[PDB]
RNA sequence: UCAGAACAAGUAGAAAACGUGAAAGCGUGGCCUAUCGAUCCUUUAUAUUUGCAAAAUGACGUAAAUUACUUACUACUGUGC
RNA sequence: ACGGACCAAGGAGUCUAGCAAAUGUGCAAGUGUAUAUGAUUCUUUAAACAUUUUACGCAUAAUUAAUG
RNA sequence: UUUUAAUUUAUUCAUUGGAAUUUUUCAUGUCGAGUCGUGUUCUUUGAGAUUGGAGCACUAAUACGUGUGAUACAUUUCACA
RNA sequence: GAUGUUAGGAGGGCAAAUCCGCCGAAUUUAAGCAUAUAAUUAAGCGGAAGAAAAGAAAAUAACUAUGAUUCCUUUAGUAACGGCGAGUGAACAAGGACCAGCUCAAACGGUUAAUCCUUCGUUUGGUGCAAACCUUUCGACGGAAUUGUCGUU
């Protein structure tokens, strides 16, 4: 929701459309008068929107309102912010790669020695 | 008071008079058969402290156990496996000599009796000598008495053979309650089994 | 091992198949247990199958805030209630010889609870009709009509369950009442720093006392 | 699950290579026709099966409570919708309203006959007839594992309180009963097919 | 279910998908983790850098409880109040909410994120990060140490 | 880690006396027996040796005695206790 | 070299501190291309960095205070590991 | 080069544990009601329903040998 | 049929014994030894200067004791037994 | 102390899935193998019960503290151990199931063993058609017991 709000911050009254789910954010204190079309609203998010005196539109509704999508703004969530994506790319072992190794837990005993510090053979 | 005094005396052990007595007693034992009934406890106070009571069905038995490690039973000294398991001669038994003593008497000698307890008595370099307190679970004197009667139950057959006498409790490592004993508490084997147990769930 | 998968840590190198318990019996077992409980209740006509446990605070820095039922009431609490341990045992209450009180407030709470329980309870005479007063702690034996009335009413199990948290976590407070000067982090860190020396001092004090 | 030692209770071992026979383990000794024969191994008469079935296979499947609830809701919705019900196979051509609501008097019916009559009156005569027809001997070995007859699934009567409904509908083929409080998705959507014909008491509703 | 298993799809091919020249033998690369640091060293290097060797201090008796301290950032502090109450608080600059962060099941307050300006917050907790405390104060709030 | 019995606990989670605000709520016969035992049994050889060492009188001698005790009984504390007892006995004898 | 992993050997720097020269400069070894070595373990250096799991040990140090389970405040706090 | 006289039946990537990505679905800063209880639940009922008129997991914060 | 709840009827007279609290005195009792423990050997343990056990050698203390409080040790606290 | 076909009794063997002691491997894994791993497993031997074993703190904790065992959910694949390789690997807390405590020894009681048992009995009951049981209190004649039974806590 916070992200949505941020996005909407420039142009008002136009309708943000999100082709996914919208979740609420406890980190936000205020919610502006938002008109949002989504595939899914989490209940709490929906409630928040309602409170804001806003509007929750489903995709069909949006279509009905704006068959050419006039005055609409497409928004996406952060895709590569997913935990899976953190393991991808260059594998940990290749220099300067920022990928999370698949490990059991965290702490000293777990993948923090040889090849992770100058002091144990090599680093990274 | 008398019993306290004798306890105190027995604490000394190495003090001349006590020592002499011990020497005498061990000498006497060396002569007597390996298992032999005794007329009366030679350590009455000690017997009392354990399970002994002055009742008809209570018997004291004296038993001699050889000291030292137990050579690992094999044809010739050779072991036929990995080096880690190859040693003999310096292999120790998991049971106490006391436990062994109680076992041997309780078994083929006194199958009818029930081992209640056992105490130390005396030793030499060859043998440790124990007096074992036993009870007849069929004697009415024992059957009636609400204190003791428990031993009359069938669950107490050959306690000595299941490590349920004090000595058994010791070597089973039940004596030391605490974090020192986490691994063995309902029973070592039982505990191990529990730990192994993978619980799947019909639902899963 | 191959590809980017987690390193295999499946402890199945022993004869594990020898010790697999599948709980096909779970629900049915539960049902059986329930039935047994019911039977027990029936046997103990009127009386509740559940025994009184005191509320107690959980150990460790992490469960400290929570309160749960402990087993047994402690002699002191029994005394406060105005009850003998044996008497308590005979009735609904669990007693704990080993438990000790270091919290006066806690003790008070426990005694209050005990009192409440006592108030709630009505005692059926040991021999019929013959109404006689209890021993040490046990209250009084009521008449027959009263007993009947009680029976007719539903036996509550509210006391045998632990009292849920008081709630707060949000309370209004005035802005003028706030203290703008209290570096809490600073205080913490200072405290941490000063620990060892404080401990030493305490030890010294103890030593002094011992003489 | 197949028994644990099935096919493997034998001491059979392979004769090795130089006897002009395959190297599968062979039953030892002589005199018997069994002696000399292939032992265990899935390909062998009297052998163990490939991966013998075991009790520790996952039988049950945990489903999100929420998911279950959702499913139930969906089923209910389907039941409400006439078309869906029709599709599901129930003979609903002669019923006015398909969210079927009936008076609390139903909860108190005491006689199967009476229940049947009521059903007929409602319009389910055809459905009842169909149900009657549809008790038939199952194709296959099911016949031998206590699944002799197959019967189609008729209406589902939902009630607030049992004052006879349970017993009065018991014995009518395909008719199922349920308390509003504990609705079963297995019953509301048999075979995972949406839109069972539900008859609701007003109280139940 | 078995019907949608690849083996069923490969059923009429000879090698069952496991290669004609290089067959499918039992445990080729070794058993379990096997030649980690020998024939499978490269894999270890590339996917599991710091696997081998031990680092740092032993800790013979841990007791994770002693060290348990669930964190919350200030950013999420005002969220901990219901919407209507929050609104009320916003309206009334005169009164500041106390928050028992421990009662909500958290042991440390950290300072990741903004707090609404001017609005004073009273924060009850066991631990605070300097920055979080500073943030709280800047907004006219107090931290009250609890135990 | 360490706490004090007197004084309420500072409402901090760490440091000395840290913790919650909750206010806290707070022979002859034997000797005779021992004497009797002594009369009966006397001492044990090691004990006698220790006594002798003590009698010898110097700091070095005392140290030696202590060492001997440690060797015999095991554990430093026990040995120390034994030594103390022996010293007491010696003193009594002197008196 | 290469997986564009490591080690190793280099190349370019940067922050110190210097050496040399009048100075620009040059110098992080040998004019360049070879002369070498993981985990674990051991060993010895480094450090206002730590721990040894309820605590303490420099130090009742510095102030106070009264006889004591007193109150503050100090980067420096045993052996061994 | 090896295997195959012929025919019929049987005859071989399976099942579980944990991890993974893929995709489906529900919910979503949460989520999963774990054991266990409760029921006007009891042919099916070993399931289905319900969850006490701050349990724990994983996730929401990382990092350091470490007091932190 | 099995038992086991509820409901029903107990009422009188005899005194031998016991019990729980509650006052106040007086008593500070007792509390398990070739046992714990240490050293050493072997085994076992996730137990790491040894987790338990065992063999052998040595061999204790009296509740101000002595045993835990997961790094050996000394001096001393404290907490729990 | 022997001894008795003395009077009255008991033990032995079979059966094991769970159960409790002992005793005790190796294949195997480590792509070899020797420590490890298999495994405190199989086999061996001995012993019980409807469950066994465990159990009423020489416990954990460091809290505002918990309070016998056992079992489940969990901690946790964690602390730790491990040619620190392969691998192995708990416990406290927390949520439950169930919840039960106790008696010897020692202290005390000598204006007295107040105890206990064998045998022979004696006379009210309750059932059952019988067979039988079930209880009731009362003494003898023996013994055991002062090297210590019973009461008291
Ligand atoms: Mg077969
Ligand atoms: Mg067919
Ligand atoms: Mg092909
Ligand atoms: Mg092939
Ligand atoms: Mg090839
Ligand atoms: Mg060939
Ligand atoms: Mg041929
Ligand atoms: Mg052929
Ligand atoms: Mg075929
Ligand atoms: Mg997925
Ligand atoms: Mg004791
Ligand atoms: Mg081992
Ligand atoms: Mg601890
Ligand atoms: Mg037998
Ligand atoms: Mg062995
Ligand atoms: Mg191998
Ligand atoms: Mg191989
Ligand atoms: Mg076996
Ligand atoms: Mg049996
Ligand atoms: Mg038992
Ligand atoms: Mg557990
Ligand atoms: Mg985890
Ligand atoms: Mg193992």
Rounding to the nearest 10 degrees, give the CA dihedral for residues E67, E70, E74, E80: -150
| Residue B160: other Cβ atoms inside 10 A | 27
Q: Is D92 helix (H, G, I), strand (E, B) or coil?
A: coil
Residues 6+ apart with CB under 8 A from C119: none
Question: For strand J, is any atom closer than 7 Å to the CB of B81?
Answer: yes
Which nucleotide comes closest to B130 if you measure CA to C1'?
A: I34
The string of DSSP codes covering chain E is -GGG-HHHHSTTSSSTTS-SSS---SSTT-STT-STTTTTHHHHHHH-TT-SS--S---SS--TTTT---EEEGGGTGGGS-HHHHHHHHH-TTEEEEEETTTTT--EEE--S---SS---EEEESEE-HHHHHHHHHTT-EEEE--
Closest-approaching ligand to the CA atom of B153: 20
Residue A87 contacts E, CB cutoff 8 Å: no
Query: Sign of torsion, CA A25 A26 A27 A32?
Result: positive
Backbone angles phi, psi at B64, to 5 degrees: -110, 125
DSSP F8: P
Q: How far apart are CA D185 and CA D193, in angstroms?
A: 10
Q: How far apart are CA D190 and CA D89, in angstroms?
A: 11
User: What's the token pair of residue B159?
Assistant: 């306690």
Helices A43-51, E83-91: crossing angle, 10 deg rounding: 30
- The answer to whether A120 contacts E76, with C-beta atoms less than 8 Å apart, is no
| Residue C38: other Cβ atoms inside 10 A | 11
Backbone angles phi, psi at A31, to 5 degrees: -125, 120
Helices B16-31, B2-12: crossing angle, 10 deg rounding: 90
**From F17, which residue of chain E is nearest by alpha-carbon distance?**
E147
Question: For strand J, is any atom closer than 7 Å to the CB of E103?
Answer: no
Residue C90 contacts F, CB cutoff 8 Å: no
Rounding to the nearest 10 degrees, give the CA dihedral for residues D134, D139, D141, D144: 30
Which residue, among B6, B123, B117, B125, has the nearest Cα to B58 in the 3D structure?
B117
| Residue B54: other Cβ atoms inside 10 A | 10
Q: How far is the CA of C95 from the centre of ligand 11 (A)?
A: 24
Whole-number CA gyration radius for chain C: 27
Q: Give the CA count within 13 Å in the CB-facing half-sphere of C56.
A: 18
Q: Where on strand H do bases come within 7 A of a protein Cβ?
A: 9-22, 25-43, 45-54, 56, 58-68
Q: Reading across the β-sheet that carries A72-75, which strands appear in turn?
A: A55-57, A35-41, A15-22, A72-75
A66: exposed, middle or buried (C-beta count within 10 Å: 0-12, 13-18, 19+)? Answer: middle
Exposed e or buried b per residue across F1-38, where buried means at least 16 C-beta atoms within 10 angstroms of its C-beta: ebeeeeeebbebbbbbbbbbeeeeeeeeeeeebeeebe
DSSP B186: S
User: What's the token pair of residue D137?
Assistant: 């001997």
Query: Sign of torsion, CA C44 C49 C55 C57?
Result: positive
C65 and C168 Cβ atoms separated by less than 8 Å? no
- Kindly state the greatest CA–CA separation across chain A: 65
Which residues of B are less than 8 Å from C14 in CB distance?
196
3-state DSSP: chain B helix, strand, coil percent, rounded to 5? 40, 15, 45
Distances from the Cα of B104 to the Cαs of B63, B97, B111, B165, in angstroms?
8, 11, 10, 13
Distances from the Cα of E23 to the Cαs of D51, E17, E40, in angstroms?
21, 10, 20
Q: How far apart are CA F70 and CA F82, in angstroms?
A: 9
Query: Sign of torsion, CA B49 B50 B51 B57?
Result: negative
Which residue, among B161, B163, B116, B118, has the nearest Cα to B136 in the 3D structure?
B116
B91 and B71 Cβ atoms separated by less than 8 Å? yes
D132 and D173 Cβ atoms separated by less than 8 Å? yes
Which residue, among D151, D85, D95, has the nearest Cα to D120 in the 3D structure?
D95
Which residue, among A86, A109, A111, A83, has the nearest Cα to A97 in the 3D structure?
A86
| Residue D81: other Cβ atoms inside 10 A | 15
Between CA C57 and CA C68, with CA C63 as vertex, the angle to 5 degrees is 40
Q: How far apart are CA C18 and CA B202, in angstroms?
A: 18
What secondary structure, in 3-state letters, does C177-194 show?
A: CCCCCCCHHHHHHHHHHC
Q: How far apart are CA A60 and CA A66, in angstroms?
A: 10
Distances from the Cα of B183 to the Cαs of B99, B172, B178, B197, C19, in angstroms?
22, 11, 10, 15, 18
Residues 6+ apart with CB under 8 A from C199: F1, F2, F16
**From F29, which residue of chain B is nearest by alpha-carbon distance?**
B1
Exposed e or buried b per residue across E112-127, where buried means at least 16 C-beta atoms within 10 angstroms of its C-beta: eeebeeebbbbbbbbb
Which residues of B are less than 8 Å from D54 in CB distance?
none
Query: Sign of torsion, CA A62 A64 A65 A71?
Result: positive
Whole-number CA gyration radius for chain B: 21
Exposed e or buried b per residue across C181-202, where buried means at least 16 C-beta atoms within 10 angstroms of its C-beta: eeebbebbeebeeebeebbeeb
* Token pair 């539960």: residue: C30
B114 and B166 Cβ atoms separated by less than 8 Å? no
Question: Checking DSSP bridges between strand A55-57 and strand A72-75, what pairing results, if any?
Answer: unpaired
D204 and D101 Cβ atoms separated by less than 8 Å? no
Which residue, among D27, D57, D20, D30, has the nearest Cα to D41 in the 3D structure?
D27
User: What's the token pair of residue F45?
Assistant: 């050889």
**From A87, which residue of chain C is nearest by alpha-carbon distance?**
C4
Q: How far apart are CA D83 and CA D190, in angstroms?
A: 17
Q: How far apart are CA C175 and CA B89, in angstroms?
A: 83
Residues 56-115 of A near strand H (Cβ < 7 Å)? 83-84, 87, 102, 105-108, 112
Resolution of the experimental structure, in angstroms: 3.2
Q: How far apart are CA C67 and CA B198, in angstroms?
A: 33
Long-range contacts formed by B69-78: CB under 8 A, 24+ apart: B69/B93
Provide the residue count of chain F: 95
Residues 6+ apart with CB under 8 A from B172: B163, B184, B187, B188
What secondary structure, in 3-state letters, does C92-145 show?
A: CECCCCCCCCCEHHHHHHHHHHHHHHHHHCCECCCCCCCCCCCCCCCCCECCHH
Closest-approaching ligand to the CA atom of D3: 1
DSSP D190: G
Distances from the Cα of B201 to the Cαs of A6, A88, C19, C26, D57, in angstroms?
48, 35, 14, 8, 10
Structure solved via: cryo-EM
Exposed e or buried b per residue across C5-32, where buried means at least 16 C-beta atoms within 10 angstroms of its C-beta: eebeeeeeeeeeeeeeebeeeeeeeeee
Looking at the DSSP bridge assignments, the partners of residue E99 are: C170, E123
Residues 6+ apart with CB under 8 A from F36: B5, B8
User: What's the token pair of residue B77?
Assistant: 């000294």
Q: How far apart are CA F75 and CA F18, in angstroms?
A: 36
A61 and A88 Cβ atoms separated by less than 8 Å? no
Question: For strand I, is any atom closer than 7 Å to the CB of C8?
Answer: no
Distances from the Cα of F88 to the Cαs of D107, F55, F77, in angstroms?
96, 12, 17
**From F1, which residue of chain E is nearest by alpha-carbon distance?**
E66
Q: Give the CA count within 13 Å in the CB-facing half-sphere of C80.
A: 19
| Residue C207: other Cβ atoms inside 10 A | 9
D95 and D124 Cβ atoms separated by less than 8 Å? yes
Which residue, among D158, D167, D163, has the nearest Cα to D201 in the 3D structure?
D158
Exposed e or buried b per residue across E80-104, where buried means at least 16 C-beta atoms within 10 angstroms of its C-beta: bbeeeebeebeeeeeebbbbbbbbe
Residues 6+ apart with CB under 8 A from D93: D86, D126
Which among B197, B199, B202 has CB closest to C24?
B202
Q: Give the CA count within 13 Å in the CB-facing half-sphere of D98.
A: 20
Q: How far apart are CA D59 and CA C27, in angstroms?
A: 14
Residues 6+ apart with CB under 8 A from C16: B196, B198
- The answer to whether E49 contacts A102, with C-beta atoms less than 8 Å apart, is no
Count of CB contacts below 8 A, C vs E?
93
The CA–C1' separation of C202 and G66, in angstroms, is: 19
Looking at the DSSP bridge assignments, the partners of residue B35 are: B63
User: What's the token pair of residue D31?
Assistant: 């005199």
What secondary structure, in 3-state letters, does B109-163 show?
A: HCCCCEEEEEEEEEECCCEEEEEEEEECCCCHHHHHCCCCHHHHCHHHCCHHHHC
The string of DSSP codes covering D65-79 is HHHHHHHHHHHHHHH
Question: For strand H, is any atom closer than 7 Å to the CB of C190?
Answer: no
CA distance C23 to chain D (A): 9
Q: How far apart are CA B178 and CA F74, in angstroms?
A: 24
Which residue, among B122, B129, B97, B119, has the nearest Cα to B19 in the 3D structure?
B122
Question: For strand I, is any atom closer than 7 Å to the CB of F25?
Answer: no
**Residue at shortest CA–C1' distance from I32:** B49
Helices F76-94, F45-56: crossing angle, 10 deg rounding: 70
- The answer to whether C6 contacts A91, with C-beta atoms less than 8 Å apart, is no
Whole-number CA gyration radius for chain E: 29
Question: Checking DSSP bridges between strand D149-150 and strand D136-137, what pairing results, if any?
Answer: antiparallel
Which residue, among D126, D60, D123, has the nearest Cα to D97 in the 3D structure?
D123
Q: Is B85 helix (H, G, I), strand (E, B) or coil?
A: helix
Q: How far apart are CA D39 and CA D17, in angstroms?
A: 16
Which nucleotide comes closest to F5 if you measure CA to C1'?
A: G69
Residues 6+ apart with CB under 8 A from D159: D106, D107, D165, D177, D178, D179, D180, D201, D203, D204
User: What's the token pair of residue E26?
Assistant: 């039992």
The string of DSSP codes covering A65-106 is H-TT-TTEEEE---STTSTTGGG-SS-BTBTT-------SS-
* Chains A and B lie in contact, requiring 3 or more CB pairs less than 8 Å apart: no
Looking at the DSSP bridge assignments, the partners of residue D200 are: D101, D158
Question: For strand J, is any atom closer than 7 Å to the CB of C66?
Answer: yes
Interface of B with F (CB under 8 A): 4-5, 8-9, 11-12, 14-18
Question: Checking DSSP bridges between strand D176-179 and strand D156-159, what pairing results, if any?
Answer: parallel
The string of DSSP codes covering F11-79 is S-SSSTTBS--PPB---HHHHHHHHHHHHHH---HHHHHHHHHHHH-SHHHHHHHHHHHHHHH-SHHHH
Provide the residue count of chain D: 205
Q: Where on strand J do bases come within 7 A of a protein Cβ?
A: 1-2, 9-12, 19-27, 29-31, 34-41, 46-50, 52-82, 84-108, 113, 116-118, 143-151
Residues 6+ apart with CB under 8 A from C110: C54, C55, C73, C74, C77, C80
Which residue, among A124, A117, A115, has the nearest Cα to A97 in the 3D structure?
A124
């Amino acid at each position: 929701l916070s992200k949505l709000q941020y996005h909407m911050a420039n142009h008002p009254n136009d309708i943000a459309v999100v082709v996914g789910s919208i979740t609420d954010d406890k980190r936000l204190f205020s919610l502006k008068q938002l008109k949002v079309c989504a595939l899914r609203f989490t209940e709490t998010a929906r409630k928040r929107i309602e409170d804001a005196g806003g509007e929750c539109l489903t995709f069909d509704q949006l279509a009905l309102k704006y068959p050419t999508g006039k005055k609409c703004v497409l928004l996406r969530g952060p895709t590569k912010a997913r935990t899976a994506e953190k393991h991808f790319g260059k594998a940990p072992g290749k220099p300067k790669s920022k990928a999370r190794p698949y490990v059991r837990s965290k702490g000293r005993k777990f993948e923090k020695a040889r090849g992770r510090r100058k002091s144990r053979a090599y680093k990274k | 008071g008398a019993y306290k005094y004798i306890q105190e005396i027995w604490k000394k052990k190495q003090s001349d008079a006590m020592h002499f007595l011990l020497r005498v007693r061990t000498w006497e034992y060396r002569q007597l058969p390996v298992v032999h009934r005794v007329s009366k406890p030679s350590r009455p106070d000690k017997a009392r402290r354990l399970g002994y009571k002055a009742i008809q069905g209570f018997v004291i038995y004296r038993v001699r156990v050889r000291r030292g490690d137990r050579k690992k039973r094999v044809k010739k000294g050779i072991v036929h496996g990995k080096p880690k398991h190859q040693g003999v001669h310096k292999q120790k038994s998991t049971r106490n000599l006391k436990s062994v003593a109680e076992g041997k008497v309780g078994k083929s000698i006194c199958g009818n009796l029930r081992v209640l307890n056992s105490y130390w008595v005396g030793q030499d370099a060859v043998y440790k000598y124990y007096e074992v307190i036993l009870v007849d679970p069929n004697h009415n004197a024992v059957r009636n008495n609400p204190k003791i009667n428990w031993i009359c139950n069938p669950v107490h057959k050959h306690r000595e053979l299941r490590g349920l006498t004090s000595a058994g409790k010791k070597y089973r490592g039940l004596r030391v309650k605490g974090h020192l004993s986490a691994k063995s508490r309902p029973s070592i084997r039982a505990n191990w089994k529990r730990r192994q147990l993978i619980k799947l769930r019909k639902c899963r | 091992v191959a590809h980017n998968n987690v390193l295999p840590n499946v402890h199945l190198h022993k004869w594990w198949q020898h010790r697999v318990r599948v709980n096909f019996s779970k629900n049915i077992k539960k049902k059986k247990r329930r039935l047994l409980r019911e039977k027990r209740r029936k046997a103990n006509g009127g009386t509740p199958i559940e025994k009184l446990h005191p509320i107690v605070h959980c150990p460790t820095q992490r469960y400290n805030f929570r309160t749960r039922l402990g087993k047994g009431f402690t002699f002191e609490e029994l005394k406060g209630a105005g009850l003998t341990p044996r008497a308590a045992q005979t009735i609904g209450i669990c007693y704990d010889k080993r438990r000790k009180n270091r919290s006066e407030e806690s003790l008070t709470k426990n005694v209050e609870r005990l009192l409440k329980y006592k108030n709630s309870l009505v005692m059926i005479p040991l021999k019929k009709n013959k109404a006689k007063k209890g021993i040490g702690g046990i209250p009084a034996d009521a008449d027959k009509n009263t007993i009947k009335e009680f029976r007719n009413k539903k036996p509550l199990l509210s006391i045998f369950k632990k009292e849920k948290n008081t709630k707060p976590f949000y309370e209004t407070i005035e802005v003028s009442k706030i203290d703008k000067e209290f570096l809490a982090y600073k205080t913490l860190r200072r405290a941490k720093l000063a620990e060892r020396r404080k401990n030493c001092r305490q030890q010294k004090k103890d030593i002094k006392f011992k003489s | 699950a197949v028994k644990l030692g099935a096919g493997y209770e034998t001491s059979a071992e392979s004769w090795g290579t130089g006897r002009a026979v395959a190297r599968i383990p062979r039953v030892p000794g002589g005199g018997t026709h069994r002696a000399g024969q292939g032992a265990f191994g899935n390909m062998c008469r009297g052998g163990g099966m490939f991966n013998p079935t075991k009790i520790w296979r996952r039988w049950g499947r945990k489903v999100n409570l929420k998911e279950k609830r959702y499913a139930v809701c969906s089923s209910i919705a389907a039941s409400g919708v006439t078309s869906l019900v029709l599709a599901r196979g129930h003979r609903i051509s002669h019923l006015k309203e398909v969210p079927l609501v009936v008076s609390n008097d139903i909860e108190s019916l005491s006689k199967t006959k009476e229940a049947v009559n009521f059903l007929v009156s409602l319009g389910l005569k055809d459905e009842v007839n169909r149900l009657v027809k549809s008790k038939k001997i199952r194709a296959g070995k099911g016949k031998m594992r206590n699944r002799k007859y197959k019967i189609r699934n008729g209406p589902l009567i939902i009630y607030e309180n049992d004052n006879g409904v349970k017993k009065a509908f018991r014995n009518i083929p395909g008719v199922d009963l349920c308390k509003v409080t504990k609705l079963n998705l297995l019953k509301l959507a048999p075979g995972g097919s949406i839109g069972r014909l539900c008859i609701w008491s007003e109280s139940a509703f | 279910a078995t019907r949608f298993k690849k083996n069923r799809k490969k059923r009429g091919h000879v090698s069952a998908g496991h290669g004609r020249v290089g067959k499918h033998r039992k445990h080729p690369g070794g058993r379990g983790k096997a030649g980690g640091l020998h024939h499978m060293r490269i894999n270890f290097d590339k996917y599991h850098p710091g696997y081998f060797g031990k680092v740092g201090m032993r800790h013979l008796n841990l007791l994770k409880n002693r060290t348990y301290c669930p964190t919350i950032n200030v950013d999420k502090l005002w969220g901990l109040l219901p919407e209507e109450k929050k609104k009320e608080f916003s309206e009334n600059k005169d009164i500041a909410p106390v928050i028992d962060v421990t009662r909500k099941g958290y042991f440390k307050v950290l300072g990741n994120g903004k707090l609404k300006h001017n609005q004073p917050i009273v924060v009850k907790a066991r631990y605070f990060s300097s920055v979080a405390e500073k943030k709280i104060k800047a907004v006219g709030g107090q931290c009250i140490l609890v135990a | 880690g360490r706490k004090s019995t007197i004084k309420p606990a500072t409402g901090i989670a760490v440091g000395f006396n840290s913790g919650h605000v909750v206010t806290k709520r707070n022979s002859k016969r034997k000797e005779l027996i021992k004497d009797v035992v002594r009369e009966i049994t006397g001492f044990s050889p090691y004990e006698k040796r220790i006594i002798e060492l003590i009698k010898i009188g110097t700091s070095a001698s005392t140290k030696r005695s202590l060492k001997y005790a440690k060797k015999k009984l095991g554990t430093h504390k026990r040995g120390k206790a034994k030594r103390e007892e022996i010293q007491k006995v010696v003193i009594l004898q002197r008196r």
